[PDB]
Symmetry: D2
Subunit: 98 residues, 4 copies
């Protein structure tokens, strides 16, 4: 779906902004532990967060969550008030009628 | 200085926003390894970045850097142009003539 | 108890072997998130492991667990079978009859 | 052979930690250094630095300790660092 694609792609761009290899590192982790990709952020935000926490810890996971939200606010601009990835996905679904 | 105070407080608030124990954890790390506090971010940004990287790795350090820059822009001017903590400190010093 | 003492001492020395600040860093994390100390490893190994995983991620938590098990092995019995901290504590309790 | 034994031993250690650690570390090493796990033998100092960049110094030190322990287990003897470990392997196979 459109919302799913924008979230996934925007997260990937954020990972690339952090460092060249973060996409590869996180994807290696997601594939090996959940047989999933970055799309998990949209499909199951809670599980995605838990997976990131298992990779670098909760502090790092929270930092990533904060960055992702800030980046989506920068792309979608309009009224994003989410404080969590779960809230962010909920808002995206409302914006795109999903 | 005004700039040192503003940068340090902004970082401290960011850590508290991340999670309840991040301030204590990072401060324990800086105290034990460099006998310094969070003010090190202003006094020697490169050393501060290096220290955070030693605590959680470079991916996590980068995420914190991005979050700090974003929060300072919201504190001072929506668009300081700094893309690194070093540039951020340089810009703050230019703004306050420090 | 003797078992609690031996396990706690083993962990503390392992932390100091890793790096000068690890004891302080892990203790800051345990204090802030669980109002507990390193003794939690004996009192509730599952919770201790979960806490370390929240600090540095599961891969790092596993490495620490592996080190703790290896150290206790070469201290008590070079024959114990523990593969997890919970199993290690269970074995210590049986060995000391606690 | 020394460079092959250290590499194979490291990989086995990574697998004992968790299923995806090998994949995770290799993804990191080749995005950042276009290198593999053999960097541990070719340049142990750099390898440790690379691992430190992935999870931090505390985690990298823990991995070093586990690697030294494992290699000692399948090889035998004196080594408390990765640099010394590689220096010892060289002496055993004249490298
Ligand atoms: Zn990808
Ligand atoms: Zn001042
Ligand atoms: Zn006692
Ligand atoms: Zn040791």
């Amino acid at each position: 779906s459109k919302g799913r694609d924008i979230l996934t792609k925007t997260i990937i761009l954020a990972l690339r902004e952090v460092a060249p290899g973060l996409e590869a590192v996180l994807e290696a982790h997601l594939r090996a532990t959940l047989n999933s990709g970055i799309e998990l952020a949209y499909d199951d935000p809670q599980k995605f967060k838990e997976a990131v926490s298992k990779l670098f810890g909760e502090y790092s996971a929270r930092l990533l969550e904060m960055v992702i939200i800030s980046k989506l606010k920068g792309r979608l601009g309009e009224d994003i008030e989410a404080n969590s990835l779960e809230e962010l996905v909920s808002e995206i679904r409302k914006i795109y009628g999903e």
